[PDB]
């Protein structure tokens, strides 16, 4: 394809410079005919012959730079086609001094008839759910895969669109909020490990706001202090691109340690206990249920025994809330979805 584009680009220029040499010939013969039987000058014929030589010197640069300006202007057209994309409308409808300074003082998450989709052309992924959580409650959510349980934690943050429902936290609706104030005062942790390069002190503190004492306590409560003390950077150790200096569970624990820096009242979690070992998972569950005792934590469980010590269990299936009670109250009853989840484990 480069050789045929080459041979086309020499074919056009060999025809066009044949036409340019014919321009030299016809300007030469009409200037010597008009200096033969008429009188122009001497020097005007030499000027016309010189610039007739110049247009054969420069016609290939005219046609080749016009083709190169078209081929390089296509990149400006593609950058402008990317540049006309949409936005998110980060500024909300509520006034920016209506909020307090400590906005999430407690957890009063009211789920009032919520239903989300992903896009404008597909189904409601969640049906009409309804909940209200007391502000000390270390609740959990289980369910099947594809049930929307990651999508409900995305629906906390308005990542998906809430086409009906009023999610109200502490007397303040989520949809009337500025989004930087929303997603700065609320801490998700995802299932997938996402880890940038640079270092650990860049990675937990990207904007240079915390001391090393709360960072080393965040490394202590992520069951992680011993390997950062073994690695010879000493908080300035280089994590590489994608986190490929470390293991996959070490990437997950570094992501959980970046969740533990920002002290909000709500630590919504997805399955960050997925793809780590069960011993440090259960030791980490006892560590996060001694540390964040005043904080509401909401987890999505990958394993059904770390949701066994939760306050309430919300089993989601196919868009709707199926069970909503204490875990032993859902265990001691009828052969249900949560009872078959703990039965199919053991």
Ligand X SMILES: Nc1ncnc2c1ncn2[C@@H]1O[C@H](COP(=O)(O)OP(=O)(O)O)[C@@H](O)[C@H]1O
Ligand Y SMILES: Nc1ncnc2c1ncn2[C@@H]1O[C@H](COP(=O)(O)OP(=O)(O)OP(=O)(O)O)[C@@H](O)[C@H]1O
What is the binding site for Mg ion (CB under 5 A)?
149-150, 247-248
Q: Is 145 annotated as a binding residue?
A: yes
Q: Is 43 annotated as a binding residue?
A: no
Per-residue binding letters, 284-323, with other proteins (x by CB under 8 A): ------------------x-xx------------------
Q: Determine how β-strand 168-169 pairs with β-strand 320-325.
A: unpaired
Q: Is 234 annotated as a binding residue?
A: no
Q: Determine how β-strand 313-317 pairs with β-strand 296-300.
A: unpaired
| The pair of three-digit structure tokens given for residue 323, joined into one six-digit string | 């069970």
Residues 238-267 that bind ligand Y (CB under 6 A): 244-249
- Tell me the window of 4-12, 149-157, 221-229, 327-335 that interacts with ligand X (CB under 6 A): 149-157
Q: Is 149 annotated as a binding residue?
A: yes
Per-residue binding letters, 230-259, with other proteins (x by CB under 8 A): --------x-xxx-xxxxxxx--x------
Given the structure tokens 């239903």, which residue do they identify? 115
What residues are paired with 117 via a beta bridge? 124, 161
- Tell me the window of 83-91, 95-103, 133-141, 312-320 that interacts with other proteins (CB under 8 A): 83-91
Of 172 and 261, which has the nearer Cβ to other proteins? 261
149 near ligand X, judged by CB under 6 A: yes
95 near other proteins, judged by CB under 8 A: no
Q: In sequence order, what DSSP letters do the residues of 274-311 get, joined into one string?
A: TTS-HHHHHHHHHHHHHHSSSSEEEEE-SSTTSSTTSS
| The pair of three-digit structure tokens given for residue 273, joined into one six-digit string | 């206990």
Instruction: Work out the angle between the directed axes of helices 2-34 and 43-83 (0-180°, nearest 10).
Output: 150
Of 16 and 322, which has the nearer Cβ to ligand X? 322
> How far is residue 309's CA from residue 175's CA, in Å, rounded to a whole number?
32
């Amino acid at each position: 394809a480069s050789l045929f584009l080459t041979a086309a680009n020499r074919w056009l220029e060999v025809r066009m410079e044949y036409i340019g040499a014919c321009v030299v010939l016809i300007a030469a013969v009409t200037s010597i005919s008009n200096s033969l039987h008429r009188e122009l000058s001497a020097g005007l014929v030499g000027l016309g012959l010189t610039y007739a030589l110049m247009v054969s010197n420069y016609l290939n640069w005219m046609v080749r730079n016009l083709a190169d300006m078209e081929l390089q202007l296509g990149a400006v057209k593609r950058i402008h086609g990317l540049l006309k994309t949409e936005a998110e409308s980060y500024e909300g409808l509520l006034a920016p001094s209506l909020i307090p300074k400590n906005w999430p003082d407690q957890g009063k998450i009211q789920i009032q008839n919520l239903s989300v989709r992903y896009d404008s052309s597909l189904k409601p992924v969640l049906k009409h759910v309804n909940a209200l959580i007391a502000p000390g409650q270390k609740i959990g959510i289980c369910g099947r895969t594809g049930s929307g349980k990651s999508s409900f934690s995305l629906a906390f943050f308005r990542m998906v669109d809430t086409f009906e429902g009023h999610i109200i936290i502490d007397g303040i609706d989520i949809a009337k909020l500025p989004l930087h104030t929303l997603r700065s005062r609320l801490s998700i942790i995802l299932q997938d490990p996402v880890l940038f390069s640079g270092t650990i002190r860049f990675n937990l503190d990207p904007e240079r706001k915390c001391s090393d004492s709360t960072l080393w306590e965040a490394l202590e409560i992520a069951q992680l202090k011993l390997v950062v003390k073994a690695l010879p950077g000493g908080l300035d150790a280089i994590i590489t691109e994608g986190g490929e200096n470390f293991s996959q569970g070490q990437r997950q624990l570094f992501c959980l340690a970046r969740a533990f820096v920002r002290k909000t009242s709500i630590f919504i979690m997805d399955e960050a206990t997925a793809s780590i070992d069960m011993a440090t998972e259960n030791i980490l569950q006892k560590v996060v249920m001694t540390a964040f005792a005043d904080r509401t934590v909401v987890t999505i469980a990958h394993r059904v025994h770390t949701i066994l010590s939760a306050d309430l269990v919300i089993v989601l299936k196919r868009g709707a809330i199926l069970e909503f009670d204490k875990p032993e109250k859902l265990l001691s009853r009828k052969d249900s979805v949560f009872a078959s989840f703990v039965r199919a484990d053991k």
